[PDB]
Design a protein around this ligand. Sequence first.
Ligand SMILES: O=P([O-])([O-])O
Length: 375
Amino acid sequence: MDINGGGATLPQALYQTSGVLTAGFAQYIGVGSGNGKAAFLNNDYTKFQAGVTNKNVHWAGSDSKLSATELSTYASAKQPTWGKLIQVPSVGTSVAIPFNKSGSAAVDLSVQELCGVFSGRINTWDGISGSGRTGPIVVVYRSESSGTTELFTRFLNAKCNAETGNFAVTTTFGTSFSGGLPAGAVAATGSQGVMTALAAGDGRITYMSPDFAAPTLAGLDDATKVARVGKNVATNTQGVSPAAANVSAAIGAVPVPAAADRSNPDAWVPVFGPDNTAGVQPYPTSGYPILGFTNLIFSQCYADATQTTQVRDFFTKHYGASNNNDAAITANAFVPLPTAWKATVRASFLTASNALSIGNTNVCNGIGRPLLEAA
Ligand SMILES: O=P([O-])([O-])O
């Protein structure tokens, strides 16, 4: 019998790569970050497989952080019997801007053009300078509670200061902008469902996992298909692509979680945000600007000893110095964590004497998420 994870679609092809998940892990089920969080927090397998109730949920992938309410509800309802949850970064990621509008000219968005496209202010292809293109822009967005949406709206919230309204940080893009969606915007479900929709009408644009924004990695560098971001015509500056190499320096510069705050799951997930605001990292000035982390949610404790070992063995691989998942991470258009980040994750969640460690024989004595499923 296996343990069950799922959630965020942004990293699902990574978790579905052979060998990334270790022994005892069922194949990852991509359903969106909101569904993944709900699956874990409520131990509700139907959020992974509709109509299927005879399994427990053991972990989730999410690119949406746990909210204050999610955390407090779990702490009061579940932690006394199941133990503390763990929320940790998995990999760093860009957010790509694929589009379906032919032409050999490179599409290179200034940040303010990106803002105007997603606010509806710029709604024709000839409103993007240097595009070579004409006709209407149709924005495709995620219908459901999405961590890609959260990562993207953090950027819009930080940068888009010149619209007729403001972008809120949210998991539901349809309500992010206080002035509404652009006329004609199209909703679709999942990373893959959005990419299918992008192709279902001409002149469409979206925001997307770099692992799905192009069929091949090198395709992230094709500016006839995946927009460059960061143009500044006044200074004669080209934007760059969402390839992992263009966000990896910025990911690597993100500070490890503050030592005295490590018992708070919120402290483990870095977020980017507005400039000169303590507690959030500013978006990078160099390289590709739209980035963040995708995360993993586990329990510290499982009533079953085999489940506990299985989970530890995954952390040993995914956060290991050797025999790790970094090659697969890169192959999936993502950024590995540096050594000091891996070491910090291991020190809290693997090293046995740490109060936070998975399966700690003192802290987890007699407790943990259940073996059997109960209705
Ligand atoms: O699916 P997502 O990753 O949540 O966007």
